[PDB]
């Protein structure tokens, strides 16, 4: 039976699976009231990608498609309707068992990035853009979304278009940033489907352990973060290896390789998430050389050493 | 001896190691006159990173640092100097044996992206949260003010004033600003990392075929443009995932040349074979330039260790 492994990568060698950002810190928040059911960075320990998860770091929160119409906002700015395809350019088939095109953002907010176009030597243009994933017009599962620009005219219809994500536009009240609220992939009156399951601790005194990244802002006040369940390199590694899961919970140890000492241990659950025995919120303070190593398979009743 | 392996990844599951882009096609250009000596996407088969190569896909052509002030420049736009640190935020030590901070761009051009800032100082009335701003920006890597090995670079903005002095600053690369002749795009021309008239150091070595009839094989990506005409590309020697895999495995190289086969897993047939050289690059027996037109399910599989005298089947 092919032994289960994790890559050997410090935090400073990992990237977020929910937005294109380096991992900054490990993080807990036991009092979280929201259901945690993110759709990017979802992979079982035996290498089954779930939700909208795909392998490319460049595909996370990306879109490809073509613009079809300009629609002026009532007050300021300009909106553009965009038909979206799969990231590989093939038509998105809404009958496939996925929530939305792979890579689609998995949270409510105003996602800031750049729209670029290369016409079918060709002409090109790029501009800053914002995608409001809570908008009624955000319907990627139906094959269409809308983005807005500060630029008022120089976006072409019927030409190949790329969205490269950069950060958030705002985290003000009216910008509806909530990293645990899913978009309505087909619009507000329709249920999302084919979702990766929600995740939670099941044992008293445990809480989720996240890989946290701070996300840039176009403007305003804030220090927003995006928390993923596993970094993108772990998704990539599990997919490659596809090791059989020998129980429902792996025990992993966060080790300092210089000293050989274990700093703490965590449960790595079959569906692809970590819990720890910690009763506080905030960053985990740990040496920069540290990383997780698989120890053994255990079960739901295993008691983790407190942090 | 730990067996050598490549990941199992189709072209549509690979990304470029020289710019944050998916791999679009395999590509050859036998009559290339330039010396091929890129500094990102450099890794030996036994896992030794070279040049300015680092592991993060978010680190490629990225910078972290602090704006100092707006500066004068004769060129169009508003210009800003920024100090640069290592990508992990630690001070860049110019005495380390690297050409420049890891992730620094390795080609001449006008790199287009976004500069973003999050202030250090916070406001009590705003919940002790900091102010932020971001704007489109261009870094001309051929500029005499592009001196990353000295810990400083310059970028230009269309925005004329809303960039703050002394505040933490990130550059997120997106594409190129232009490929007109006056924008000096040349993917095989290295920047001068310490400025005009200085010699670069600590470079990963140049790469070339050393067997008649062979040429380099590249993983090509098309790079976005802010404006103007063009369909520019960036060619890497190995995708970022191969750098990441080789670093993980660190398998001993049992000769100077690994034979690999590009396979269609559907039919299990070999489309062509290639040499994967110790220093981290591929050659094939091909006598034309342009894309390699191959099934989308295709990937390289390690076959065996051969040597420099092995003759490849023509593509």
Automatic annotation (TrEMBL), chain A:
Record's keyword terms, sorted: Host cytoplasm, Virion
Domain Calicivirus coat protein C-terminal: 84-307
Record's GO cellular component terms: host cell cytoplasm; virion component
Signal peptide: none
Location in or out of the cell: Host cytoplasm; Virion
Name of the protein: Capsid protein
Organism (species): Norwalk virus
Lineage: Viruses, Riboviria, Orthornavirae, Pisuviricota, Pisoniviricetes
Stretch of the intact protein here: 225 to 538 of 548
UniProtKB/TrEMBL annotation, chain B:
Highest taxon listed in the record's lineage: Viruses
Gene Ontology cellular-component terms listed: host cell cytoplasm; virion component
Domain Calicivirus coat protein C-terminal span(s) in chain numbering: 84-315
Subcellular localization, as worded in the UniProt entry: Host cytoplasm; Virion
Keyword Iron-sulfur recorded: no
Membrane-spanning ranges: none
The entry's keywords: Host cytoplasm, Virion
Protein's recorded name: Capsid protein
Species of the source: Norwalk virus (Norwalk calicivirus)
Lineage: Viruses, Riboviria, Orthornavirae, Pisuviricota, Pisoniviricetes
Residue range from the parent sequence: 225 to 538 of 548
């Amino acid at each position: 039976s092919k032994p289960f492994t994790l890559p050997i990568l410090t935090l400073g060698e990992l990237t977020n699976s929910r937005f294109p950002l380096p991992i900054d810190v490990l993080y807990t928040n036991p009092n979280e009231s929201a259901i945690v059911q993110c759709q990017n960075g979802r992979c079982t320990l035996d290498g089954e990608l779930q939700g909208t998860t795909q392998l490319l770091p460049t595909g996370i929160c990306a879109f490809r498609g073509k613009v079809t119409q300009q629609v002026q906002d009532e007050h300021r700015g300009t909106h553009w309707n965009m038909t979206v395809t799969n990231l590989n350019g093939t038509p998105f088939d809404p009958t496939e068992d996925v929530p939305a095109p792979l890579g689609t953002p998995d949270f409510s907010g105003q996602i800031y990035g750049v729209i670029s176009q290369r016409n079918t030597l060709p002409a090109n243009r790029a501009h800053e853009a914002v995608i409001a994933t809570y908008s009624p017009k955000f319907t990627p599962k139906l094959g269409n979304i809308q983005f807005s620009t500060w630029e008022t005219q120089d976006v072409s219809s019927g030409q190949p278009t790329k969205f490269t994500p950069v950060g958030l536009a705002s985290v003000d009240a009216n910008s509806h940033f909530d990293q645990w609220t899913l978009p309505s992939y087909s619009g507000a009156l329709t249920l999302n489907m084919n979702l990766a399951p929600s995740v939670a601790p099941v044992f008293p005194g445990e809480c989720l352990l996240f890989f946290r990244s701070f996300i840039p802002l176009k403007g305003g006040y804030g220090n927003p973060a995006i928390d993923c369940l596993m970094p993108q390199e772990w998704v990539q590694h599990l997919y490659q290896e596809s090791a059989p899961s020998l129980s429902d919970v792996a025990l992993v140890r966060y080790v300092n390789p210089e000293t050989g000492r274990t700093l703490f241990e965590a449960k790595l659950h079959r569906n692809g998430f970590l819990t720890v025995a910690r009763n506080s919120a905030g960053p985990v303070v740990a040496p920069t050389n540290g990383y997780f190593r698989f120890d053994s398979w255990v079960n739901q009743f295993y008691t983790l050493a407190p942090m």
